[PDB]
Each structure stands twice: as structure tokens, then as C-alpha cells.
Amino acid sequence: MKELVLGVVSHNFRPEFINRIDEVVVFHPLGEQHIASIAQIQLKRLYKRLEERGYEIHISDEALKLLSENGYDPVYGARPLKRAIQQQIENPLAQQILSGELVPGKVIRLEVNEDRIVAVQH
Amino acid sequence: QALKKYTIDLTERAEQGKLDPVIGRDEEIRRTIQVLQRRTKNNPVLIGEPGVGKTAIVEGLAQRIINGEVPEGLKGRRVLALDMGALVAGAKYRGEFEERLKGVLNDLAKQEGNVILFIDALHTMVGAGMDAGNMLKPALARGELHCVGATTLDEYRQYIEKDAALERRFQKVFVAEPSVEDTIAILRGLKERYELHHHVQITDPAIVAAATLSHRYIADRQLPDKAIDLIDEAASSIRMQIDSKLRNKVTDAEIAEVLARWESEREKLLRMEQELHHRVIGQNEAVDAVSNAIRRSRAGLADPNRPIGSFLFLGPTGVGKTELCKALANFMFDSDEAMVRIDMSEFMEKHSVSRLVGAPPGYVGYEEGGYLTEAVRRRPYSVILLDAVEKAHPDVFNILLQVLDDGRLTDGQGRTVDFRNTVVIMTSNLGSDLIQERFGELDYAHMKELVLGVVSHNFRPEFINRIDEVVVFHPLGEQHIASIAQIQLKRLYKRLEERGYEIHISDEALKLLSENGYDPVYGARPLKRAIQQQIENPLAQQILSGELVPGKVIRLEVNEDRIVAVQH
Amino acid sequence: QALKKYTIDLTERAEQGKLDPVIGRDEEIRRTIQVLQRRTKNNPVLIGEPGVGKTAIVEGLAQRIINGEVPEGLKGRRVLALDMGALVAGAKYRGEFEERLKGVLNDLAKQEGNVILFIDALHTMVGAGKADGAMDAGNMLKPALARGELHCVGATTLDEYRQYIEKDAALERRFQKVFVAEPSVEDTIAILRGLKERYELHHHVQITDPAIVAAATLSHRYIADRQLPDKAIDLIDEAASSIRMQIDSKLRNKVTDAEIAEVLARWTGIPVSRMMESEREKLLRMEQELHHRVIGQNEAVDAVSNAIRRSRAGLADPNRPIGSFLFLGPTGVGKTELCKALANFMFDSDEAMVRIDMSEFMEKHSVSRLVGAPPGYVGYEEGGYLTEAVRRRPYSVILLDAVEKAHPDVFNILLQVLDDGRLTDGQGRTVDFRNTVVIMTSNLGSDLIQERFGELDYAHMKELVLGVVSHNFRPEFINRIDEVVVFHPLGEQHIASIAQIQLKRLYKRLEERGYEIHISDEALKLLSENGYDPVYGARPLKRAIQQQIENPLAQQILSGELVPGKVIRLEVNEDRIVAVQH
Amino acid sequence: LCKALANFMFDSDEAMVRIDMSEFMEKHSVSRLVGAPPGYVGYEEGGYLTEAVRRRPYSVILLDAVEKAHPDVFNILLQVLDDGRLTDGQGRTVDFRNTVVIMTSNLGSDLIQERFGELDYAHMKELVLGVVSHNFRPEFINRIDEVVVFHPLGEQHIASIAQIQLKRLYKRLEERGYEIHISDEALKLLSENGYDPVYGARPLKRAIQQQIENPLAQQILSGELVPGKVIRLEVNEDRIVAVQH
Amino acid sequence: AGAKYRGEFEERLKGVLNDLAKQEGNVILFIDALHTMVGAGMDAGNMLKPALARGELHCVGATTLDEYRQYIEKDAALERRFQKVFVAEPSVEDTIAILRGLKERYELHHHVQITDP
Ligand SMILES: Nc1ncnc2c1ncn2[C@@H]1O[C@H](COP(=O)(O)OP(=O)(O)OP(O)(O)=S)[C@@H](O)[C@H]1O
Ligand SMILES: Nc1ncnc2c1ncn2[C@@H]1O[C@H](COP(=O)(O)OP(=O)(O)OP(O)(O)=S)[C@@H](O)[C@H]1O
Ligand SMILES: Nc1ncnc2c1ncn2[C@@H]1O[C@H](COP(=O)(O)OP(=O)(O)O)[C@@H](O)[C@H]1O
């Protein structure tokens, strides 16, 4: 693969220009568990943003599997997962918070529907 | 006077005789007399590269005036010279160029036209912010101006041939660079002045040696400027050698010292087989063929409209084919950097030709230019490298026939790209297994003839007609490629000794390194990358942990299947 | 006063008579007077292309004022050549230029309608006082212009008019356009007959009046740089200085038309020079000199000899080029050799010419490579290669080789070329091809020529190959050809003579190397046996000479075998050719 | 005919706007007739055409070899023949309502050499106008006022052309100084040596060129002829030579 | 600093140049920033240019290659009195030797000591 893409860049560029590269390196699509780990990272920064808002959030691992099965295809990149997170978490959450409903202090548990994600206040 | 502000009298010092006894360039002085003795348009201009003695032309005209060697209309004149570099650099705001300019014009109107002015850099007069074409162009047509212009043809047609009204007054006088023998004649006219200055003598064989070597090796400044510079600085060096704490005659040895610092040509051409085996092992017959072709090109019997040598290369790639081209460029002209690697694998169409030679105007790759010819224009003494020439479109071979016939090639942009100073290397691998499988005990010549017949059935016969010699590039054995791996280990140890580490090796480790990436099908660079990736990566892993110390003996001892580094 | 500081009285100079006699220009001076006697916008501007005599119109008007040959309203006036450099120069302070210009304008109002103002370089008056927040001269003159109370006279080039005045319409309508055309030949001869007295008083020499009419005639025909009368005046002046230095340095005392031709040939090198007996015996030995390099192929030598003689003999078709040719023959019969022979005859060099091989142009759009690219596109500011290569040195030879390779519609360009010698590059200026020779080569009926050059006349062979050419080209294009010639395969005697020529240039280059070398005629016979075929001609002789001479001889020179001064006979081996050292 | 128009109208042969479409073989060169649009390379130079009609409006536009161009260049001339206003790259209009627009082509000259006989002028104009309708669009050809048809030149016209070219030859040679006569039979040799009804008048001219000027330039450059002599173009059995009397 | 007239600073410059002509080659001068003498504000560079082109100047210049290339080489008489005498950057070891030349200077000023490692 490195040899063939090196031939491709040789079709693109000067030949001895790309000899001066430190190394022709390859980035690639990624596997299943990497998606779940980086989704946990994005959930962590979401927790940080809403803790700076003043809100504290618990998640279901079922909801993590819902995210990992909804915002998934290696064929494009990461940001389908990012806007899947964005939509399916924040949009009901922005519906609930600007409603003036969520009192701080109560745990924002990311419960699930059959497909969607619900935040409750018990 | 305002003449005591920006003008220089040369009839002053020439009446004193205190200028250069200018010898040569008589015809340019004659045409200056032709323009200056007209009734109108009496402002000649001198055209040439800077440093051709145009100031000396004006001063020699002044000396002919003082000597009375001029006709009776040039007499009583005063040679003047105006600055074009202070009328603008002093000019802060509106009208300080023009104020000084009109002051000069009126104070020369007091002089009543008995004054000849010099002006260099006529291009500077056009653009200074309007400025002076609109104020000298009347005096250019009034005839009361007696200017002497001096610039170069390229700035002349870039700036000055725009406005034809400025063009119609000045009269072009081409002052080219003088020859080596004209330089000899001028310096023999000026050896007396040097030897009366430093109270020494001058070797005239060292003069002609300085002229020849200054013409050959250095092209920064030109004749006669560089010869004056080298003679005066070498005379200064000899003067310091005399007055340090012994010869008065400056020798050509000091000329060569100031030449290289501030001769190995002919026998290096004669010993070119040893030169090719200075860095490349194996391919002895190919070395002999290349060296004989180089010497025959330097023999001076072939066509002066044809290049150094026409070549086609065959055999297994990567074994040192490119390395041969690198060492050939090194001991041919300079170094390992005058070469252009070109894959003919890409070019298979008509717009392939439009890429490689040059686009027609109005199209996609035009001032991006041709892939070959622009790189030739940048490096006029190089070696042209081609790769997989069998993968070319057939009309590219018409361009190749133009190369091997005329030694020149009009690009898409429309100019001349000379080829009589490079080496056409074209590499292929059509008769690969004919040489690889029959490497054993078959000669160089009949294998060459056999694969020559094969490629004759492959390529065009008129194409390979122009080829001087096709070397074989027989597959090197394990000992030659092992020795090349040893040389790579030597330069590796050289760079690590630049880093500063005493490093040894096991011979079994050397055998395993030689047997990492040995392959007759691909080339030597698999062995290179194999040894590279095996050694280099765990090395720095051991280093930056804080294990290795500069000065410790590092034997590359073997593991069972690996190589371990020790610190002893 | 302020008029003394910044204006120059031309009428006082013509009162001293220190200005040039101006003859002609009657409708131009009359319309200038008609504009100068008006009520609003009195101001004529001499739009004329650079160097047709525009300053001299106003100078002749000043002389007609001094002589009193004007209407009564202009008798006693003063023409003041206004200076712009006198006004810009002293003012880096704010308002100091406007101070000067307003003081000048108040003086011109004070002069009660008696001063005619002349402003040379009106385009210098446009960008005059352009300091940061400053009026130019336009914003200050512009009141007094269109109240009629200033009698300005402009004098500008037409290209300066477009950029510097038509960009500013306000000052552009304040004047009155006076087109001042370049004069025709006969009136320019009349003007030069007027100006003979000045140059006779200057250089103390005389001028042939046939040399004057020849200078005007050849200047209008051949020089395309400058414009009349400027180029002819410069011819006469430079000839006068040349005659003055021929007398004064080390013969004659006048300026003949041969001196005009020598000036023109020194300036470019179009061979207008009269047939001196060296040149004329050279030209009568045309075919003899062409067979000093090209053996055989007599008929094209005859045709091109005829064409160049008709060119040099003053029988040139003054619109078509010198010779519009077409070469036809099989591969390797020295067509390019004949073209290099013409270049060597004409210019003492083979590659003092332009060869453009049309095998490079197998696509259509390389038309734009040789004629240029339009405004807007990429290579606009460079020109076409062919047009520029002519535009430097118009007297040259334009060679097109391998004409069957290109697309058929490249040859509308050469329709223009062989109709008038005119070609219009991408910037849009004409390039005169009236001093060019166009040679086109192909290998169309090479099978037919190799088949039927025997047992056939030259004429019906030319007929049949012309039929083949009409199968190839357009009927428009082949009408433009002066003559189509037919080549033929050579006999072995021609190739032996070519081998003799190669031995001559070889011995020349080896005397340059410094070796006295001879050859056995048996070796010449072996070389004639080697590089011979009727199908390909002498390119097999080229490669045979190449290999069997350049490899062993240069190999033995570098072997230290060949000592200079030794007689070196190139004798034969059993199958090869051996050098000896005797 | 167009240069004769220039000679009548301006007392001058080569004073006309000759923009030959034989360079304009692409849709590109519309730019080089109406200048580059703003921001591009030769913007401040304008069109070649609209500048040189803004200088002198009363002139002749000449478009020789008009069919060679890419067929959608003529839309410029849709404007020129509808109103005679053209808009170059600098936005301004150059008013062509005094210009004399002339176009010359040979779109059916095989058919015109084939059938100018045995058909009248009207049906020939009809059929060649059908051919031009196959080569142009109805937009363009509806603008042209008169589309004439030209026929080739028979022997009388060839004799007249030979006389005019020998007039300009003698007119050149008068400044060379050699008043030369001719045999009246030599005119018949030129007619019989210049006659081919498929190429018109130029083979006549180059036959005149060869069969007169090559002995003439041969004998003048021979060091043989002195000015003022009565010189005649007497014939040989096949040649025509110059004699000195 | 001691001049405030257009014709007193220039008077000083003229008098010093006449004294340089008077000393008859014994004085070998140095002036750094020759481009600054070109543009100081008749500017002083063009005032000393007669002392260039009269065979009297024994001065030395000092600048960057940019000002020598632009403000000097592009001038004519200012070119043909000089060379491209290039000041090199020294070595690290030469720098350490020069530091040893002036270690004691800084130590005696600041009352401290400097270690050679
Ligand atoms: N025929 C000659 N006799 C004596 N000295 C000569 C002759 N030709 C050139 N020189 C010297 O060659 C040197 C060339 O310097 P310049 O006159 O400055 O060259 P240039 O042609 O004027 O170009 P630039 O732009 O001024 S460097 C001077 O020192 C001249 O004195
Ligand atoms: N009718 C004429 N009679 C006499 N001399 C003439 C005549 N027309 C032009 N000349 C001369 O032609 C030369 C050039 O004409 P000028 O007017 O000086 O040039 P110009 O008109 O200023 O052109 P530009 O704009 O400066 S490029 C002068 O020497 C005039 O004397
Ligand atoms: N009559 C001749 N005189 C001199 N050289 C000739 C002649 N005929 C052929 N040659 C040689 O043969 C080659 C033919 O050149 P060229 O005219 O380019 O061939 P082509 O006929 O294919 O155009 C030349 O390079 C020349 O060396």
C-alpha cells in the first residue's frame, strides 16, 4: 500500500521532492472499539461543557451502544459520529434546558427509548 | 558649481594623463564619433552586460580628444558623467528629482553645448516614480544634450522600447564581452601600470592562465572585470608575501589558489574508468564503455550540433543504474545534483507531449512549463535521466530524434533549449531475463548484440540508430552488492561518528545484513531499506533511554536471528 | 516675470531664425488656425503617431507668424512653448505648484489675447501636479479652457492620448482632435528636398537627390520601426556623418544612394546593396555554390536560384514574399541540406536561420504556438514564436519541414503569409514577411517518385505529384506556392561525392585538431558499399560514416597512436578501414 | 476587388482594415477582436478592431477566407450587421455605421466552377446560397445585403490581367530604368502558358514570373543591359527572350 | 551634535575632507554604515564620492550585504572603489576564545566569576 501510494504521489509531485519526506505515512479507516473509545472522549468533553454550565450527566452503556451503532461508518471519517452525538444528545437536551425545566443538582441520566435518547429528572 | 556636485570631468585627468590607457574597442569609439557628429539625435547609447568597460570607452574617447585623435568637431569638449542613483535617492517628495534635473539643464545651458555627458543605466531614467523622459526628451531632440548612454539590451527593451519616442533619439551601440585574447591585449596594455604601481613584475603566462581560467570556472563577473580583479588581488597577495617578514612575478599557482579558494581536468578525463570505480563496484565493461564515450566526446571529432552522448540502458533496475548516473554527474561536471529523474511510464498520450515539452499558449501548463525543458534551462550542464522508455507514446520519440539530431528543442513557450552539454540516459528493462538468466559465463559483447536485436524488434530502428552504445548492466553478484552494503555501513558509521560513536560489527552480522534484502529482481535499494529499518529504529530506542555513551565501543554482535548492540 | 521663468518663446527663436524650415502640412496648419480663432475651446491638439512632425507643425506656424503669412487676427502674436518640467520641479511644499500655475494663468489673462500657448506632451500635462491632495494641471487649466480664454496647442502621440487623456473625459473634450497622418512618399521627398540646405550647411558635404528619393523609397518599403519623415531624415543624417568621417579620417565628397544602401544594410542587413562584382559574380555562380554542398537535385537548385536572382535584381513582387516554395522527395535526399545551403549562401552560416519542424504540430491548436495567444489568455505578453523570430530579423529564411505530419488546418496562417507577407500576432500588429523565403518539405509521393523517376520526364512527374498534392492539401494553399519542385533518389556517384564532402569537412576538423590524414580510394568504395540504399538515401551514409569513422579513428587518437605531422593514410583492412602512421 | 475599393475610396491600396479570419480558427480569438474583459491580461489595450474603428470610422472591414474560422465567431458580426455597434472589453461602444463590411469565401467553388455555365446567375446564387445556409446559420446570412457569386476567368480576362501585370512590371522597371517592349505573339505565349480554368489568375502570374523575369533577371545580372535601350520581348520557338536595340 | 546650520556641518565635512587630502595617504579611515552616509540628510555620501573618484580616500566601510548590494553596487563610482569583503561568522571555538578574552572584563565589572564549562 505504501509502495502504491508512493507511486501515486510520484504521479502527483516531483520524484526527488517526495524522497525528501521523512516517511510517506498512511492514515486509514478505523475499527469498532476505537469508535466507542473516541465517543467516550466526546462524551467527556460534553460532560465538561455542561459541568461548566453547572449540570451533571450520567450515561447508560446501552446509550453508548446506540451511539456506536447509529453514528458509524469507517468509509467517511469521524464527524458522522460527532453530529450523531450532537443531534441525538443535545437537541432534546436543548429542548429541555431552554424550557426552564431542568433544576441543577439532579442527575441528568441519559436513558434510552427504543432508538432515541431521553434525559430524565428524578 | 553645480558641476561640482554631480558631474565628473574626465578631460581633467586625461589632460593630466591620469586615467587608463584604454586600448581596444576602436570601432565602438568610431560609432560614438558617428552619432556625436550628427546634427540631431546626438545621444548615443552603449549596450552590453555590466562590466565591459563602457566607462573605459568614454575615457578612451577623452584620451583621443586630449591626444587630438578626433575630428575637428569634438574638440574643446568636457567629458561629464551624471548620477542616476542620487537624483532619486535624495528625492524625498515632489520635485527634488526634477529640481536637480532642471538645475543641471540650466547650468549646462550656461556651458553652451561644449560638454559631453555620460549616463549609465538608461532603464533607471524611465522609472523613478513623469521623471526625466518628459524633461530630457526635449533636450534629446534639441541636440544641446550630448549624452552617452549605457545599459543592457534586456532592460532596454523592457523599459525603454515601450515608449518609441524615447527610443528614436538614442542610438544603439552593442558593446559585447571581449574575448580572452582581447583581454590579453588590454592587460598587456595595462601590465605596465600595474608593475609601476606595486614595483613588481608580472608573468604573462600567468596572465593568459588567469584569463583562460577566469573565462572557464567563474561566470559571476565577466571580462575584463574579473581579470583585473584576479590580477590585482593576486598581486596584493604576492605583495604581502614580499612584505610579510620570494618572487615579484605573480605566478599562475597563486591564480589557481585564489581561483579555487576565493588543475584536475584532463587526466581526470583520462582516468575516467578509475573515476567510475571510485564509488561504484562492478560493471567493469560498462565503466569502460562510458569512459570511452566520455573521452570520445572530449576528443572533439563528432558533430558540433549533437550532444555529448546518446545512450539507452537496459537490465535489472535499482542495482546502481541511478547510482551510475549520480557518480557520472559527479565526476562529469560537478556533483550529485545536476540530474533530472523522469519516468516515461506516465507519458502515453498527446497531452503527455504537451506536458513534457511545453504547453501551447493559452493552455493549462504554459508558464508552468515543460517537465523536461524547464529543468534543462535551469541546469544547462546536467545529465538527463529517463525511466521505462518503452512506456512512452510513440510521438515522444520524434522529440527524442530532434534531441539526438539537432541537440536543441523549441519548447512550448518558443525559445531554444540547447542539449549539447548534457548526457541522455534512457533506462529500460525489456531484456531483463535475457541478461539475468544468462548472466553465467556469457560475454558482454554478444549479450549486448543479442539484447540489441531484441530491442531492435521492440523499438524503432531509426531511434536506436542514433544511440551510441547500449551497455548491458549485468546483475551484480552477492559480493559486489555486499561490498555496496559495506560502503553504506561505512557512510552510516561516518554519520554516527559525526554524532560521535565508536561502532564495530560482527562479520556474521555483516552476512545477515547482506542477506536481508538481496534480490535480483528489484535492485539494491531493497537491501538498503532492509538494513536501514533493521538497524536504525531500535538503535535510537536504546540511545534515548540513556544507555549509549559517546566513546563506548559498539560491536554489532549477533543474536540468534538478530543483531544486538553492546557498550564496551 | 513669471512668463520669463516657465515659458519659452518659439516666435522669438523663429524671429532669430533658429528653427527649422517647415514645408507642407497645409490642411493641418489651416485647421489649427481655424481652431485657434474660435470663441469657446480654442485649443487644437496634434494627435499623431510618434514622429510624423507634430512639433514641426507648431514651429512652422510660428514661422508663418514671423513671416506674416497668417490672417490679420494672428499678426503679431506670440507662441509660447509651455514647460512642464519648469513647473513641477520646485514644489515639494503644498500649493507652490498651484501658485506658479495660477500666476501663469493670470499673466495669460493679462496678455489681452495675444499669447498663443503651446504645450508639448499634453499627456505630461495630465499627470502634472499629482501630489497627495493636489490638483493636477487639468483641475487648474480646466476653467480657463472652456471659456476660450486660453490658447493652448497640444501635441501628443495617439497611444498617449488613449491612456492619459481618454481616461479623463473632462479634459478630453476641452481640446479639438487634429489627426496628423504620416505623409506619403512623394510629399516626404518634397520635405527632404526642403531640408537638404540644413544638412549641407551642417556637414559641409553635398547630397545626391536620387539618394534622397531612394532613401525615402527604401525607408517606406523596408524599415518598419519608425514612421515618415523620421526614418528618412535619420537615414540622410547618418549617411552624412558617415561621409564626413570617410573624408576626415583617411575618396568622395557627396552622399550617393549606394551610401544609403550601405546605411540600410548596416542597420539591418536586407541586401539592398548594389551588385558589386564580387557580389554579382557570386550571384551568377549561384548553382555552382549550391553544388559545393549539395550534389545532385538540379531542378530545385535552378528554381531557387531563379527566385533569389529575381529578388536581388529589383524584380521582387512587392507584396508576396521572396519565394513561396514546396519541396517534395523521398526520405534522406538532402532537402534540409539545400535549405542549409541557402542559409549558408545568404548568411554565411547554416544555423543563422529559423527552422520550425511541423512534426511538432500534429494537433491543431499549436497554431497558437506560432502566432500567439489572444488578449486575456495565458501567453499574451510573449508573442508567437514565428512572428517574433521574424520581427527581429525580417530578412531571413523560414523553414517548415515534415509538412504531412500536421493537421491540414494549420495552413490558413500561411494563406495570409503567402498572400501578402502579413501576419498578425496575438497583440495585434502586422509583421512584414516581404523579405522571407518559405520552404516546405514532405515525402508524399516517395513511393511514386522511387517508382517512376526513371523512364519519365521531370514535367509529367511534377504533374502527377501535383495531383497527389491536390489529394493532400487545399486548392487555396497550393495556388499560393511560387513553384513546386520534385526530388529524386540519388545514384551511387552522388553518395560518393557526399562522402568526399564529409572527408573534406573531416580533414578540416582534423587540421583544426592538427592532423595530416589521407585515405585510400578503396576505403571510399567500401564506405559507398556500406551506407547505401535507394530507399533511405544518405542517412545510412550518415550512420556508416558515424560508426566506421568516428569510433575507430577517435579510439586510436585517444590511444596515443596518432601523432601530429605524420602522414595518415586511411587504408583498408580485410573488412574494415585502418589508419597508418607514416 | 476589396483592395480596389480601398484604392478608390482612400487613394491608397493598403489602407484598410484587413482582419482575416484565417487566424480565428477557434472560439478563443473573439477576444483578440474585442479586447480582453476587465482584470485580464491585455485589458488596457482594447480590441484590435474596435480601437482601429474608433480611430477612423469611415473605412473598410475586410474578412478574407471567412469560412476558416470556428463557426461561432460570426456572432460578433450579428451585432455588426444588426446595428453596427460593438462593445469591447472596456465597456464602450464603437459605432460601425459608416464601415463597409466585406467577407470573401469559397464555400462551393467546385460547384461554381462546375455549373456557372448552363445555369443563370439567379439559380446559381440560389444553390450556392443553399450551400452557405448549410455552412452558416439563418441569423447571419439574413443580415448580409448581397451575397455575390464569382465565376472564373476566360482567355480575354487572362489577357487583360497579363497586360496589367506587365504594366506594373514596366512600372517597377522604370525606376530601374529599362523601358521594355513586348512581342504581341509573346502575349499569346503567356496566355497559352498561363491558362488553367481551375485556379484562376495566379498561375498566369507565376508563369509570367518565370518565363519573363528569369531571362530578364538573368540578363540584367549578367552585366549586359544598359538603361535607355529599346528592349523587346521577342519569342524563341518556345522561349521568350529580351533583345537589345 | 555640534552643528545646526546647512553649511556648518557641511563646512566641517569639507574641512575634514581637505585635511584628509592634506595628510597624504597616512590616514587610513573607517566609516561603518556607508548606506547611512548615502542617506544621512548635498548628502554626505555623494559629497565623499569626489574623494572616492579623485584618488584620495583610504576609508573602510561596514554594512549588511543588502545595503552593499542595493545602495552601493547599483551605484557606479561607489561600486568601483570597493570589494565584496565579506565578514564571516566565526566558529564556536573562536567565540569561546573571544569569551576568554573578555571573561575577566565582565567579572571585574559585575564582581562575579564565570565558569569555563
Ligand atoms: N580597452 C580597455 N583598455 C583599458 N581598460 C579597459 C578596457 N576595457 C575595459 N577596461 C577596464 O575594464 C573595467 C570595466 O569597468 P567598467 O568601465 O565599470 O565596465 P562597464 O562596461 O562600465 O560596466 P559597469 O556597469 O560600469 S561595471 C574598467 O576598470 C576599465 O578600465
Ligand atoms: N513638414 C515638415 N517640414 C520640415 N521638416 C519636417 C516636416 N515634418 C517633419 N519634419 C522634421 O521631422 C523631424 C521630426 O519631427 P518632430 O516634430 O521633431 O518629431 P515629433 O513630431 O516631436 O514626434 P514625437 O512626438 O516627438 S515622437 C524634425 O527634424 C522636423 O524638422
Ligand atoms: N545532396 C546532399 N548533399 C549533402 N548531404 C546530403 C545530401 N543528400 C542527403 N544528405 C545527407 O542525408 C541527410 C538528409 O537530410 P534531410 O534533408 O533532413 O533528409 P530528408 O530528405 O528526410 O529531409 C542529411 O542529414 C545529409 O547528411
Numbering used by the authors:
A (entry chain F): 737 to 858
B (entry chain A): 159 to 287, 293 to 408, 527 to 543, 553 to 858
C (entry chain B): 159 to 408, 527 to 858
D (entry chain C): 614 to 858
E (entry chain F): 247 to 287, 293 to 368
Q: What did the publication describing this PDB structure actually write?
A:
We studied the disaggregase ClpB, which contains tandem ATPase domains (AAA1, AAA2) and shifts between low and high ATPase and threading activities. ClpB is composed of tandem AAA domains (AAA1, AAA2), an N-terminal domain (NTD), and a coiled-coil regulatory M-domain, which forms a repressive belt surrounding the AAA1 ring (Carroni et al., 2014, Heuck et al., 2016, Oguchi et al., 2012). ClpB activation requires two signals: (1) interaction with the Hsp70 partner chaperone and (2) binding to substrate protein (Lee et al., 2013, Oguchi et al., 2012, Rosenzweig et al., 2013, Seyffer et al., 2012). Each AAA domain extends a flexible pore loop bearing a conserved aromatic residue, in most cases a tyrosine, which interacts with the backbone of the threading polypeptide.
We therefore made use of the derepressed ClpB-K476C M-domain mutant, which mimics the transient state of ClpB activation by Hsp70 (Oguchi et al., 2012). To allow stable substrate trapping, we used a ClpB-K476C-DWB variant and incubated it with an excess of casein in the presence of ATPγS. The states were numbered according to the position of the AAA2 domain of the seam protomer F, the region undergoing the biggest conformational change and were termed KC-1, KC-2A/2B, and KC-3. The biggest displacement is observed for pore loop AAA2F, which moves upward by 34 Å, placing it at the top of the AAA2 pore loop track in state KC-3. The AAA2F pore loop is now placed to grab the substrate two residues above AAA2E. In KC-3, gain of activity of AAA2F and loss of activity of AAA2B leads to a counterclockwise cycling of the four active subunits by one protomer. In KC-3, the ADP nucleotide density in AAA2B and the displacement of neighboring AAA2A arginine finger by 7 Å from the nucleotide suggest that ATP hydrolysis at AAA2B coincides with conversion from KC-2 to KC-3 and AAA2B inactivation. Activation of the seam subunit AAA2F in state KC-3 is linked to resetting of its pore loop from the bottom to top position, indicating that sequential ATP hydrolysis around the ring dictates substrate threading in sequential, discrete steps on the substrate.
